[PDB]
Amino acid sequence: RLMNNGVGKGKTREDHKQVSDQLYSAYANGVDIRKLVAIIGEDALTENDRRYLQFADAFERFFINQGQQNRSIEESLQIAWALLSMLPQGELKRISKDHIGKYYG
Amino acid sequence: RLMNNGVGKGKTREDHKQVSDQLYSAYANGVDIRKLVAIIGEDALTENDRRYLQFADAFERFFINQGQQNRSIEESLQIAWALLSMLPQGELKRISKDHIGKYYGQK
Amino acid sequence: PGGDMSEPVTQSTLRIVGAFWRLDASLAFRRHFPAINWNGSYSLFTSALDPWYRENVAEDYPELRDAISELLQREAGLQEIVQLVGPDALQDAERLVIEVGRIIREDFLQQNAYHEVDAYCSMKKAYGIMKMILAFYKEAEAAIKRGVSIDEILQLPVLERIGRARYVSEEEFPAYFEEAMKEIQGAFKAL
Amino acid sequence: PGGDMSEPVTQSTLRIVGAFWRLDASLAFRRHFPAINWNGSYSLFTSALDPWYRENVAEDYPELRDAISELLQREAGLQEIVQLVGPDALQDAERLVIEVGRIIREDFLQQNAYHEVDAYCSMKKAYGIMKMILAFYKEAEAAIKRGVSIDEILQLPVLERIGRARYVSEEEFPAYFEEAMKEIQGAFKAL
Amino acid sequence: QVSPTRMNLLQRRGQLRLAQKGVDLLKKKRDALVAEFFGLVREAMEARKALDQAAKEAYAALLLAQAFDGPEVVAGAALGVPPLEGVEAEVENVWGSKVPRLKATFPDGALLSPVGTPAYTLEASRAFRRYAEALIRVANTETRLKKIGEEIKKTTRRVNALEQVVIPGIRAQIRFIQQVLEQREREDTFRLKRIKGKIEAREAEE
Amino acid sequence: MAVIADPETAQGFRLAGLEGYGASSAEEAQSLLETLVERGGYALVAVDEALLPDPERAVERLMRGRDLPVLLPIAGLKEAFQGHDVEGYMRELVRKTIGFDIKL
């Protein structure tokens, strides 16, 4: 219920709320499509549909599965950016664009 | 529970337990094939499965439908082998060929 | 109290009686009366009454009655499949079982007490209706192993006779029975 | 009673105990004794017995324990397409997973609890059987891609020596092991 | 939500058992459909083999009959022949599903001046007639295999849907009804404690 | 009963006594197929494999029901020299049809 207090300027990086909101919305749609593939065939899809499939499996394998290591907030946010770089900027509905300009490469 | 201690060498007849397991598995895959044949049809199965369907359908009126006659143990095993004869030899994959060659075949 | 036969009244009174007639609400929501749930009723006097049935109603009465019983059991065994898959995509030799179960529930079992006739029904009339229904089912499964439709069975002009054959009085019912039996025996060679 | 693991006896037991071995009646019906099921059975002590195994068994021991755990999970994963389609219609990168799964389940795990020489099995002998099956898998997965497919593998007289390697006394075993491994390292070059 | 009595618990156990029978029955139905699918795919292979070889026969026949001969005379020999309508169809109903399969009449009665003025187009024309027979054969094999495939798709999503949806929903309702009935039995075995306590606090008021 | 590889092969189909066509492009073939579904040549059509493998876009265009114009890939006269794909074609049939990839 908090984390709206504990993000932002002078607490974490500026983009922390927008990265969290974007990753949640993207992984919700990813698990929607992975529910959809269980019913309809693999060809009823567009191309950023498959990009959400790839982002779902890439999220579940690289963002969560850390095993033991001592990630930072810095390494965590740049892993979140290198995951979001696997998606089109037109699919980035949430993040205000100057974070995208400083990052996403 | 105790059937495995009450049949066998000099207890009732030496082929008993294997016929017990065989009748169980044969009626087990007779019931559900008899239930499947409603939605596929008589003439859209294999052939041994229709043998199983005939076996189960005649089994539950020649073996369980006893009535009131004082049915001995040799007579009941005899009718059990008469029911097992409607399955093909070789498909009886629980009995070695000693009791097969001795008892099987006779309806 | 709850409408649930799991009480200390009902499951203390069902151990000391024969002839337990369990009603239900689903057969009484639509007006299918009496709402005897057939699937959970019983009667322990079927065995030891068949001498009287033989010497007073008909000689073949246990045979006909047990055939009615096993047709209703076979129907209620196929209701599982028919609600899990649907009444299409079936084999035509069992949709006759379900439709004969439907016509026995709409003719033999279902009875309105307020109609002037069919309130009372002595047992020769019930023997007549069961003999009609099983003559129909026997010769209909014969005619479907010859190979026909099952639309062609369910639109005969021979079973509106059956559906009205509980409303004739106990005086017309012999001659009516002879003529309905004649037409059931004579309307299957013409398919 | 019911064949369920939700009653509070089993729930409190699983909250307190350290290792759980679900015995099944189906796996004991397929004449696979012991009837342990390697899917819903779990231990927790493996993380802290690890330095004991590296001291007294062999220095590589939890690696190949993880290898057979992964191999049995691959088999129980892709048993589905074997069950639907047909086992011959498999690939060649999954047919060998199926067959090394079978050679595990019929030589390594399955144990006669009445045989004179089979019933006891120390850590060196289970290490030996385990290393032979892992060496078969690795050299076969190396050699499936260049000269053979699975029919040019699944009959070879080393597999009989693996499948009968467990009826060997442990005064005879640690010379038998080197010779069976030598013959498999020569055999997948002779192919 | 649903009325929590011991009767309703039995109805829910009955329908859980019926759905668990239904998973087994529909898997067996899928197994029989897969059996005839793999019985038909090799017929599709053999039909494609015969189609391509008779295709090569009719292609070489036309190559000879328009290379050793006139393109204008095969034009006249084609356009003199009428278009020959008449192919017809019948009905397969199996597992409920229904497809029409076709066969052709192909009349040979058009013996248009039956001393055929090239020596080759009777040969090539009968080659193309056998070609079209093989083509309608491959068409019927195709539509039968597509019907089997889509029905296996239906049965697979039906098994998966029925399992993952209406096994755990019914399990959840059974657990709901069992826990509310245990609450009622716990309130009974509390109230009986109090009425026994306040009957035995009467000898202690004497 | 239209069949579309060339008009040169199609006049051989007229030499067989059935109607056929040739387009040498995709949309032209689907358009003549579209008027052939509209007014029938009794609804049994094959199209060249190098022209259109799957013309079923025309089925979902005009006649989604009854699947009466059956659409067939066919080996062309310049392609029947090779024996097109048969075993890998069945591989992709299984891959398309049941989901699984098999070897058999």
- Triad E4, E8, E9: Cα angle to 5°: 90
d(CA C180, CA C107): 14
SS (H, E, C) F40-104: CCCCEEEEECCCCCCCHHHHHHCCCCCCCCEEEEECCCCCCCCCCCHHHHHHHHHHHHCCCCCCC
Q: Which residue in C143, C126, C102 sits closest to C53, CA to CA?
A: C126
Per-residue DSSP letters for E7-62? HHHHHHHHHHHHHHHHHHHHHHHHHHHHHHHHHHHHHHHHHHHHHHHHHHHHHHHH
- Nearest CA distance, F57 vs chain E (angstrom): 16
Backbone angles phi, psi at B19, to 5 degrees: -65, -35
Contact C104/C71 with Cβ under 8 angstroms?
yes
Do F18 and E132 count as a contact with CB atoms less than 8 A apart? yes
d(CA D37, CA A6): 48
Q: How many CB atoms lie within 10 A of CB D128?
A: 24
Question: Chains that contact B by 3+ CB pairs under 8 Å?
Answer: C, E
d(CA F1, CA D169): 77
* Chain B residues lying within 8 Å of E95, measured CB to CB: 39-40
Across the B:E interface, residue pairs with CB atoms under 8 Å apart total: 19
Torsion region of E4: left, alpha or beta (phi above 0 gives left; psi -120 to 50 gives alpha): beta
Query: What tokens does A32 get?
Result: 């929607």
* Chain C residues lying within 8 Å of E97, measured CB to CB: 89
Query: What tokens does A100 get?
Result: 């995208």
For D86, which residue in chain F has the nearest alpha carbon?
Answer: F104
Which structural domain range is residue C128 located in? 44-191
Cross-strand pairs, A12: A9
Backbone angles phi, psi at E169, to 5 degrees: -65, -40
Q: How many CB atoms lie within 10 A of CB E62?
A: 27
Do B32 and E29 count as a contact with CB atoms less than 8 A apart? no
Cross-strand pairs, F47: F4, F73
Query: What tokens does D25 get?
Result: 């009646």
- Reading across the β-sheet that carries F3-4, which strands appear in turn? F3-4, F44-48, F70-74
Domain ranges of chain E: 1-206
Residue C23's SS3 state is strand
Contact C137/C96 with Cβ under 8 angstroms?
yes
d(CA D119, CA D167): 9
Per-residue DSSP letters for chain D? --S-S-SHHHHHHHHH-SEE--B-SSTTTTT-SS-B-SSS-EESGGGTSHHHHHHHT-TTHHHHHHHHHHHHHHHHHTHHHHHHT-GGGS-SSSHHHHHHHHHIIIIIS---SS-TTTS---HHHHHHHHHHHHHHHHHHHHHTTTT--GGGTSS-TTHHHHHTTTS--TTTHHHHHHHHHHHHHHHHHH-
d(CA D117, CA D120): 7
* Chain E residues lying within 8 Å of D86, measured CB to CB: 38
- For residue B11, the 8-state DSSP code is S
d(CA E91, CA E100): 4
Query: What tokens does E156 get?
Result: 């697979």
What are the residues whose beta carbons fall under 8 Å from the beta carbon of E3, sequence distance 6 or more?
Answer: C2
- Which stretches of chain E sit within 8 Å of chain C by CB? 3, 5-8, 10, 18-19, 21-22, 25, 95-97
Cross-strand pairs, E102: E89
Backbone angles phi, psi at A83, to 5 degrees: -80, -40
| DSSP H/E element including E152 | helix E121-166
d(CA E135, CA C68): 54
Query: What tokens does E148 get?
Result: 């089997």
Contact E145/E44 with Cβ under 8 angstroms?
yes
Residue F4's SS3 state is strand
Torsion region of B88: left, alpha or beta (phi above 0 gives left; psi -120 to 50 gives alpha): beta
CA distances from E72 to A54, E62, E64, E68 (A): 60, 14, 15, 12
d(CA C180, CA D129): 81
Backbone angles phi, psi at D42, to 5 degrees: -150, 145
Contact F85/F97 with Cβ under 8 angstroms?
no
d(CA E61, CA E118): 13
Q: How many CB atoms lie within 10 A of CB E138?
A: 19
| DSSP H/E element including E91 | strand E88-94
- Nearest CA distance, E170 vs chain F (angstrom): 30
Cross-strand pairs, C23: C36
Across the C:E interface, residue pairs with CB atoms under 8 Å apart total: 25
Residue A7's SS3 state is coil
* Chain E residues lying within 8 Å of A35, measured CB to CB: none
SS (H, E, C) D109-140: CCCCCCCCCCCCCCHHHHHHHHHHHHHHHHHH
For C89, which residue in chain B has the nearest alpha carbon?
Answer: B39
Please report, in angstroms and rounded to a whole number, the separation of the first and last CA atoms in chain A: 32
CATH number assigned to the domain comprising residue C91 = 1.10.1140.10
Identify which of B32, B35, B40 has the shortest CB distance to residue E32: B40
d(CA E188, CA E182): 10
- Nearest CA distance, C120 vs chain E (angstrom): 34
Query: What tokens does F54 get?
Result: 């799957």
SS (H, E, C) E108-120: CCCCCCCCCCCCC
Residues comprising chain B, all counted = 107
- For residue B88, the 8-state DSSP code is P
Q: How far is CA E14 from the centre of its chain?
A: 30
Q: How far is CA D100 from the centre of its chain?
A: 8
Rg (CA), chain B: 15
d(CA C15, CA B100): 48
What are the residues whose beta carbons fall under 8 Å from the beta carbon of D150, sequence distance 6 or more?
Answer: D92, D95, D96, D99, D144
State the best of E34, E72, E102 to mutate against chain F, taking most chain F CBs within 10 Å: E102
HSE, side-chain direction, 13 A CA sphere, residue C114: 1
CA distances from B24 to B56, D128, D172 (A): 11, 41, 44
Do F102 and D85 count as a contact with CB atoms less than 8 A apart? yes
* Dihedral sign, Cα of residue D165, residue D169, residue D170, residue D175: negative
Residue D145 identity (one-letter amino acid): K
Asked if D2 has any chain E CB less than 8 Å from its own CB, the reply is no
Residue E103's SS3 state is strand
- Nearest CA distance, D91 vs chain F (angstrom): 6
Contact C150/C92 with Cβ under 8 angstroms?
yes
Whether the bond between F55 and the residue before it is cis, its omega within 30 degrees of 0, is no
What are the residues whose beta carbons fall under 8 Å from the beta carbon of B23, sequence distance 6 or more?
Answer: B59, B80, B83, B84
Query: What tokens does C88 get?
Result: 């299409």
Q: How many CB atoms lie within 10 A of CB F16?
A: 27
Which structural domain range is residue F84 located in? 1-104
d(CA B83, CA B68): 20
- For residue E93, the 8-state DSSP code is E
Contact A80/A19 with Cβ under 8 angstroms?
yes
* Chain E residues lying within 8 Å of F17, measured CB to CB: 81-84, 106, 110, 125, 129
- Nearest CA distance, E9 vs chain F (angstrom): 39
Residue F3's SS3 state is strand
- Which stretches of chain F sit within 8 Å of chain E by CB? 1, 3, 9, 11-19, 42, 44, 46, 66-68, 70, 72, 74-75, 77, 80, 83-84, 86-87, 89-90, 93-94, 97-99, 104
Tokens 């990052």, residue located: A103
What's the farthest any 2 CA atoms get from each other in chain F? 43
d(CA E178, CA E6): 9
- Nearest CA distance, A51 vs chain E (angstrom): 24
Contact F104/E34 with Cβ under 8 angstroms?
no
Strands F44-48 and F3-4 come out as: parallel
Query: What tokens does D190 get?
Result: 């002779």
The resolution, in angstroms to one decimal, equals: 3.9
Cross-strand pairs, F46: F3, F72
d(CA E13, CA E170): 8
Do C91 and B35 count as a contact with CB atoms less than 8 A apart? no
Contact E48/F86 with Cβ under 8 angstroms?
yes
Contact D160/D142 with Cβ under 8 angstroms?
no
| Helix, strand counts (H, E) of chain B | 4, 0
| DSSP H/E element including E94 | strand E88-94
- Nearest CA distance, B2 vs chain E (angstrom): 29
d(CA D90, CA C46): 59
Q: Which residue in C97, C88, F67 sits closest to E96, CA to CA?
A: C88
- For residue B20, the 8-state DSSP code is H
Contact F74/F49 with Cβ under 8 angstroms?
yes
Q: How many domains does chain F have?
A: 1
Backbone angles phi, psi at F21, to 5 degrees: -145, -175
- Triad B80, B81, B87: Cα angle to 5°: 105
Contact F23/F48 with Cβ under 8 angstroms?
no
For F91, which residue in chain D has the nearest alpha carbon?
Answer: D89
d(CA D131, CA D118): 18
What are the residues whose beta carbons fall under 8 Å from the beta carbon of A19, sequence distance 6 or more?
Answer: A77, A80, A81, A84, A95
Q: Which residue in C181, C19, C39 sits closest to C105, CA to CA?
A: C39
d(CA F73, CA F52): 7
Q: Which residue in B61, B35, B69 sits closest to B49, CA to CA?
A: B35
| DSSP H/E element including E101 | strand E97-103
Asked if F38 has any chain D CB less than 8 Å from its own CB, the reply is no
Our answer on whether C and F touch (3+ beta-carbon pairs < 8 Å) is: no
Query: What tokens does F7 get?
Result: 């008009």
d(CA B90, CA D67): 39
Query: What tokens does E205 get?
Result: 């008021």
Do D92 and F103 count as a contact with CB atoms less than 8 A apart? yes
| DSSP H/E element including E88 | strand E88-94
Q: How many CB atoms lie within 10 A of CB F102?
A: 19
Tokens 């057939």, residue located: C38
HSE, side-chain direction, 13 A CA sphere, residue B5: 2
Asked if E94 has any chain B CB less than 8 Å from its own CB, the reply is yes
* Chain E residues lying within 8 Å of F53, measured CB to CB: none
Cross-strand pairs, E101: E90
Query: What tokens does C54 get?
Result: 């033989």
For E96, which residue in chain B has the nearest alpha carbon?
Answer: B39
Do E28 and B36 count as a contact with CB atoms less than 8 A apart? yes
Contact E30/E158 with Cβ under 8 angstroms?
no
What are the residues whose beta carbons fall under 8 Å from the beta carbon of E182, sequence distance 6 or more?
Answer: none
Residue C42's SS3 state is strand
* Chain C residues lying within 8 Å of E3, measured CB to CB: 2
Q: Which residue in F88, F43, F83, F89 sits closest to F62, CA to CA?
A: F43
Torsion region of A66: left, alpha or beta (phi above 0 gives left; psi -120 to 50 gives alpha): alpha
Residues comprising chain C, all counted = 191
Q: How many CB atoms lie within 10 A of CB C189?
A: 8
Contact D90/D82 with Cβ under 8 angstroms?
yes
d(CA E144, CA E102): 12
Per-residue DSSP letters for C48-81? GGHHHHHHHT-TTHHHHHHHHHHHHHHHHHHHHH
For E28, which residue in chain B has the nearest alpha carbon?
Answer: B36
Q: How many CB atoms lie within 10 A of CB C75?
A: 20
Which residue stretches of chain C are H helix? 10-13, 26-29, 50-56, 61-84, 92-104, 123-145, 160-164, 173-186
Query: What tokens does A19 get?
Result: 């990265």
Identify which of E106, E124, E138 has the shortest CB distance to residue F15: E124
d(CA F18, CA E132): 9
- For residue A9, the 8-state DSSP code is B
- Nearest CA distance, D55 vs chain F (angstrom): 46
Backbone angles phi, psi at D157, to 5 degrees: -75, 15
- Nearest CA distance, B32 vs chain E (angstrom): 7
